[PDB]
Scaffold this active site. Structure first.
Site, PDB file in Angstrom:
ATOM      1  N   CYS A 108       0.874  -1.170   0.000  1.00 24.26           N
ATOM      2  CA  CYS A 108       0.000   0.000   0.000  1.00 24.26           C
ATOM      3  C   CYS A 108       0.916   1.226   0.000  1.00 24.26           C
ATOM      4  CB  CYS A 108      -0.993  -0.095   1.174  1.00 24.26           C
ATOM      5  SG  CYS A 108      -0.263  -0.517   2.837  1.00 24.26           S
ATOM      6  N   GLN A 133      -2.810  -0.687  11.379  1.00 26.06           N
ATOM      7  CA  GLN A 133      -2.407   0.647  11.841  1.00 26.06           C
ATOM      8  C   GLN A 133      -3.419   1.331  12.757  1.00 26.06           C
ATOM      9  OE1 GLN A 133      -1.533   2.167   7.691  1.00 26.06           O
ATOM     10  NE2 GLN A 133       0.119   3.244   8.753  1.00 26.06           N
TER      11      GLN A 133
END
Ligand SMILES: O=C1CN2C[C@H](N1)c1ccccc1S2(=O)=O
Length: 283
Positions: free
Chosen positions: A215, A262
Site C-alpha cells: 500500500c 495501523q
C-alpha cells in the site's frame, strides 16, 4: 474465545481501542540497523516504518542490497508474503529487481497513486501497451500486455524481461482501487471477492515465489490482506476452526514486520472479513 462472539462482545463494550493498544504493547521489537544507515535515507518513504534486519529482503547487488521490504513466513499455514512500501521515484528499479529475483508471480496493490490530494506511490507500471518502461539502473524492461477494469479492482497482465539474459516472465498485477481515502470499507464483501481472485490466479501458491503486497507504507491495508488470508487458510486446515485466534496470528506476523494493522478500525475490519469469509468458504 471464538471470533464472532468475541466480536459482538467488543462492539457492545466499545473496547476496540484497548484491544488494539494491547497488541501494540505486546508486539516484537527487533533491530532495523540497515534501514537507518545514512546512505538509505532516500530508499525509505516514512522514517518510522522500517524492515527488521532478520527478515528484510536483500537485493542481489554488491553495492547496496537495501529495499524497504520484509518476508512474512507463516509456518503452520504454509504461506509466505513479501510486504513492501509503495515504490519511490528512486526505487522503482529496485522494486522490479526484487520481483524478478524472488520469482514472484503476482503483485497486490491496495492504494491509488494519488489519495487525499498527495502522491502515495510512484507510477511504476506502464499504462499503454505501446509505451513500455525501461529501468536502466537494474536492466529490466516492463510491458503492459492487457488490462481488465472492474468496478472494485483492475487486473493487469505484464511482461518483465531481464535484459541481461533476455529471459521473460508473465507477472499479474492485482489492483484494489476502491479503499476509501478515510477509514475502512463498510462491508468486507468486495475485499473478500478480491482476495479470492488473487488466490484463483495461483499467485499465492507454493509453485511460485512469495506474492509482493503493498500500500503506501506496506503495514496497514497490506497487513489486513495477509492477516485475513492466513486466518481463513488455518480455519480450513484445523480440526477445530473456532480455535483460530486472530490476535495471536497478528502478533506472529508482527515478528516479521513492524506495525501491521495501523488502527483499531483496521483491526475490527479484519475480524469482519474473516467472519464473513468463513461462511462463504463452506462449504
Ligand atoms: O518525499 C519523499 C521523496 N523521497 C522518498 C522520501 N519521501 C524521502 C524521505 C526523506 C528524504 C528523502 C526522500 S526522497 O528520496 O526524496
Amino acid at each position: 474465545m471464538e471470533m464472532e462472539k468475541e466480536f459482538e462482545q467488543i462492539d457492545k463494550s466499545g473496547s476496540w481501542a484497548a484491544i488494539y493498544q494491547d497488541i501494540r504493547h505486546e508486539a516484537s521489537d527487533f533491530p532495523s540497523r540497515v534501514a537507518k544507515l545514512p546512505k538509505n535515507k532516500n530508499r525509505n518513504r516514512y522514517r518510522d516504518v522500517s524492515p527488521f534486519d532478520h527478515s528484510r529482503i536483500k537485493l542481489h547487488q554488491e553495492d547496496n542490497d537495501y529495499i524497504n521490504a520484509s518476508l512474512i513466513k507463516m509456518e503452520e499455514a504454509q504461506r509466505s508474503y513479501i510486504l513492501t512500501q509503495g515504490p519511490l521515484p528512486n526505487t522503482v528499479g529496485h522494486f522490479w529487481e526484487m520481483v524478478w529475483e524472488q520469482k514472484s508471480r503476482g503483485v497486490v496493490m491496495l492504494n491509488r497513486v494519488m489519495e487525499k490530494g498527495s502522491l502515495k506511490c510512484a507510477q511504476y507500471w506502464p499504462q499503454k501497451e505501446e509505451k513500455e518502461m525501461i529501468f536502466e539502473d537494474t536492466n529490466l524492461k516492463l510491458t503492459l500486455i492487457s488490462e481488465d477494469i472492474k468496478s472494485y479492482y483492475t487486473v493487469r497482465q505484464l511482461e518483465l524481461e531481464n535484459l541481461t539474459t533476455q529471459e521473460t516472465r508473465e507477472i499479474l498485477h492485482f489492483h484494489y482501487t476502491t479503499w476509501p481515502d478515510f477509514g475502512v470499507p463498510e462491508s468486507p464483501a468486495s475485499f473478500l471477492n478480491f482476495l479470492f481472485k488473487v488466490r484463483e490466479s495461483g499467485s499465492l501458491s507454493p509453485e511460485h515465489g512469495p506474492v509482493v503486497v503493498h500500500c503506501s507504507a506496506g503495514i496497514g491495508r497490506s497487513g489486513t490482506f495477509c492477516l485475513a488470508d492466513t486466518c481463513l487458510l488455518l480455519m480450513d486446515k484445523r480440526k477445530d476452526p473456532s480455535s483460530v485466534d486472530i490476535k495471536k496470528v497478528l502478533l506472529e506476523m508482527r515478528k516479521f514486520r513492524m506495525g501491521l494493522i495501523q488502527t483499531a478500525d483496521q483491526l475490527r475490519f479484519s475480524y469482519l472479513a474473516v467472519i464473513e469469509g468463513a461462511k462463504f468458504i463452506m462449504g
